[PDB]
Amino acid sequence: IVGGTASVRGEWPWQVTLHTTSPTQRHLCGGSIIGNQWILTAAHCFYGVESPKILRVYSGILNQSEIKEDTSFFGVQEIIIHDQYKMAESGYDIALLKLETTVNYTDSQRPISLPSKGDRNVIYTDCWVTGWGYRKLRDKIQNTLQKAKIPLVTNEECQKRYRGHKITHKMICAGYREGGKDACKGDSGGPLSCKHNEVWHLVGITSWGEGCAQRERPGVYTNVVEYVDWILEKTQ
Numbered sequence: 001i002v003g004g005t006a007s008v009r010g011e012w013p014w015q016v017t018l019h020t021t022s023p024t025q026r027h028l029c030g031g032s033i034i035g036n037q038w039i040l041t042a043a044h045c046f047y048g049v050e051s052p053k054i055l056r057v058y059s060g061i062l063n064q065s066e067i068k069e070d071t072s073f074f075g076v077q078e079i080i081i082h083d084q085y086k087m088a089e090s091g092y093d094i095a096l097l098k099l100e101t102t103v104n105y106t107d108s109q110r111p112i113s114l115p116s117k118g119d120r121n122v123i124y125t126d127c128w129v130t131g132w133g134y135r136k137l138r139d140k141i142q143n144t145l146q147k148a149k150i151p152l153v154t155n156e157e158c159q160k161r162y163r164g165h166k167i168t169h170k171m172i173c174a175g176y177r178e179g180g181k182d183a184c185k186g187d188s189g190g191p192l193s194c195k196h197n198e199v200w201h202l203v204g205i206t207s208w209g210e211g212c213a214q215r216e217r218p219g220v221y222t223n224v225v226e227y228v229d230w231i232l233e234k235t236q
């Protein structure tokens with residue numbers, strides 16, 4: 001996260017850190033708890049992942065340094081990537097992880113609601129992006145989970161900034177015209193979380209952008225409301 005600040009314990013309890021363990025253990029991507037056995041993340045995260053065997057899902061983590069050899073994690077039973085996914089910038093950047101067992105929800109690990117039916121024309125004004133990613137283009141994975149408030153951009157404006165890509169209704173863009181706050185390397189797969197009527201909704205999945213927090217280049221997120229039918233089909 002560029003231009004963000006440290007979170008505190010319990011602040012974003014649907015945020016998980018997805019680790020790979022091949023050839024060594026490290027944070028790979030963010031993700032969001034959406035059901036007791038379900039994580040929503042980005043399809044692009046699984047480039048070069050040979051199988052679910054090498055993945056570990058950690059919930060309730062504030063600092064990456066908390067994770068030791070006896071820290072409990074969830075195994076991944078299945079990775080479900082959208083059948084039309086080809087590359088992040090072309091869309092369909094969405095994946096479900098089915099966990100090997102059910103999360104018992106606690107103060108530190110909680111689900112986030114999907115965008116609610118009948119809310120498609122809501123204007124979200126309280127949106128946040130979170131993650132352990134770089135604070136600048138050439139940086140390093142951060143120890144403490146970071147947060148930044150970022151405004152949504154219309155798809156018309158976003159397309160004008162990305163005339164070499166097809167910005168579709170299944171994408172949502174977020175960023176300041178002057179730059180300065182954005183997702184960056186290591187944040188992808190995590191949530192764009194928006195609060196509406198004091199309820200948090202998973203509005204976006206952190207996906208791609210031109211650089212990090214550059215002027216007039218918003219971050220691009222998978223527009224989760226356009227995938228609710230797909231999510232419900234797979235989780236049922």
Ligand SMILES: Cn1cncc1-c1cnn([C@H](CC2CC2)c2ccc(-c3c(-n4cnnn4)ccc(Cl)c3F)c[n+]2[O-])c1
Binds near residue numbers: 047133
């Ligand atoms: C894990 N890891 C450890 N060391 C470095 C990484 C690392 C490098 N790439 N990634 C991922 C893609 C990789 C998982 C398959 C990525 C790509 C792009 C953006 C991004 C960008 N960025 C543009 N240029 N950089 N970021 C801008 C806006 C937005 Cl919304 C974004 F989602 C964010 N992530 O995470 C992680």
